[PDB]
Amino acid sequence: EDLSNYIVSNIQDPLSRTKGVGDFQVFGSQYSMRIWLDPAKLNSYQLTPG
Amino acid sequence: KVNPDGSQVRLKDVADVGLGGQDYSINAQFNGSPASGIAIKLATGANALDT
Amino acid sequence: DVSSAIQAQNVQISSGQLGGLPAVKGQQLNATIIGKTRLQTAEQFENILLKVNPDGSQVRLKDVADVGLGGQDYSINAQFNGSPASGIAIKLATGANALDT
Amino acid sequence: TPEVGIVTLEAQTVTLNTELPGRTNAFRIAEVRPQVNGI
Amino acid sequence: MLAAQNPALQRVRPNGMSDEPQYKLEIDDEKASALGVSLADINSTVSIAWGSSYVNDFIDRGRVKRVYLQGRPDARMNPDDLSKWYVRNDKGEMVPFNAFA
Amino acid sequence: LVTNGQANAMATVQQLDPIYVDVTQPSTALLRLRRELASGQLERAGDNAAKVSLKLEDGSQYPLEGRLEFSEVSVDEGTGSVTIRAVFPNPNNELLPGMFVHAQLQEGVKQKAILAPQQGVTRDLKGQATALVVNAQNKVELRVIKADRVIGDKWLVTEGLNAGDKIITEGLQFVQPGVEVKTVPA
Amino acid sequence: LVTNGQANAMATVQQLDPIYVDVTQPSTALLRLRRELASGQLERAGDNAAKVSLKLEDGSQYPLEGRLEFSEVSVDEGTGSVTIRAVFPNPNNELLPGMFVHAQLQEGVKQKAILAPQQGVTRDLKGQATALVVNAQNKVELRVIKADRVIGDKW
Structure with missing residues (x-):
């Protein structure tokens, strides 16, 4: 996912605008700040994912 | 809270x-070492060599 | 509610x-x-x-x-010789033939 | 070759104070309630 | 099968996937709403806790990327771990998914 | 009209030569303190452990340094927080009862604490804290480190970095890992 | 001013050397365990039926084990769950009354259990579990099995 972030953040945006490329597909994804809800501690304080 | x-x-x-x-869901892997790639489709009405 | x-x-x-x-x-x-x-x-x-x-x-x-x-x-509802019916009303496209359509 | 400022770091001892929120309450507060009735 | 037995074809394929097990959890509707928890809270809990919801964006290192929100890699892995998730009642209490699902 | 045993107060008489400062610590912090004081990686303070200093509503430190007593034993159901009482002297009318102060409860003493500058620890694209370190063969490396608490203008490191090493504080630019460099003091 | 029969208190004197742990349990799971224990396949143990052994708020195990106590007879209409107490020793005052905690009390020891792995068990057209087995004359056949509990990575 480091290399996939590097593609989506630095190669994909100048390469999708060139003369000839109409559709692309990356094999991976960029970074996205995931937040992993622990349901025991999310139970501890009377809270929901909402 | x-x-x-x-x-x-x-x-x-x-x-x-x-x-x-x-x-x-997709995790490419190239020739034994970890990697990633972008696949590229040619737009219609254009050429392959110039692209 | x-x-x-x-x-x-x-x-x-x-x-x-x-x-x-x-x-x-x-x-x-x-x-x-x-x-x-x-x-x-x-x-x-x-x-x-x-x-x-x-x-x-x-x-x-x-x-x-x-x-x-x-x-x-x-609102819109049709009839046909007394018996109740409905239908679509087709318009031909641009640059097209009527017999082929 | 480049000449850059480089530190030489060693072990030491620290104190590790932790920050915690709160309010201040009064030391000896006495709400004057009447204990007897009338105007 | 009738094309694989046919001597005029060769290696016919489905170009698709076949039927596989999938876990249909049935929310007991009336019991859940009678215990007090509103059903929009149940749907928000299910969709955010498993379906990897999308909240808003954030910038980093000169590019706006996105923030996702999903349960742990250890609390959705088997049907015994669909009971670790609790949904709030209408009065601050906590109701498990074993009661109504 | 005033009745007997009235719930509504007629007037409020309070004196503040000391002021109680009620401070809430989350219970997981007390639990990781109980896990780390039992191991040798965090020694108890002892004679200096009671002193606390409070941060006022303008970010300015309060000049006097009071002491705490009775870290409570009942947590609350909602936020899971142990309240901790601290007593502060108050000669003038500086602190007022009902403010929102912070407090610096200090506990633990590290007996082997490595401590790197702010301008020597930078974040990479992972989000991890990285530092540039020169080998004994006089070439640069990168070591992934974790950085717990800011002390003044310097981080402290827990693992990943060892004592007696060198990190580059100033001159991080035009230096990449794997190149030769010479160490000058600055 | 402090009046007779006051509703709100003045201080809280409390001891905690044997603590009490009010463990909840939703009544569908207790009724399913009562069904699985009245149906004669799993045997309730006697040597380790009263060990509770909580693990604390940050996933750390508590070093002492304590006795299990009654199960309260009424479910509560706001969440639908019984409450089971437990008696834990607390010599070093290392756990406070009111924290959130998870208990591991066992519900039944299955004797002579077989574990089919996750690879060999699938579902047919109706929803009942199957597994292909090989006969003694070396020929496969379909057979319908009842697998509903995942332990480890084996049904």
């Missing part, structure tokens, strides 16, 4: 925050 | 997946969890419940509204 006493819970007391991919 | 309840009952929610990525090491099970699905027949809109006390007594949509399939737009 935070009470008027001043006792709060943060997001660290519920979840562990860290960066990861936005979807993990 | 009936509108908010019906927008709460037949939701087609993305209910996730068992064993979905990222997986803990040693996972061998995968299945696409289907949660609720949006309702289909008259007996399933007929059992939308609006308010319910903790004692168990509820108010379904039987006791509030008469529910059944009807037209989307009741």
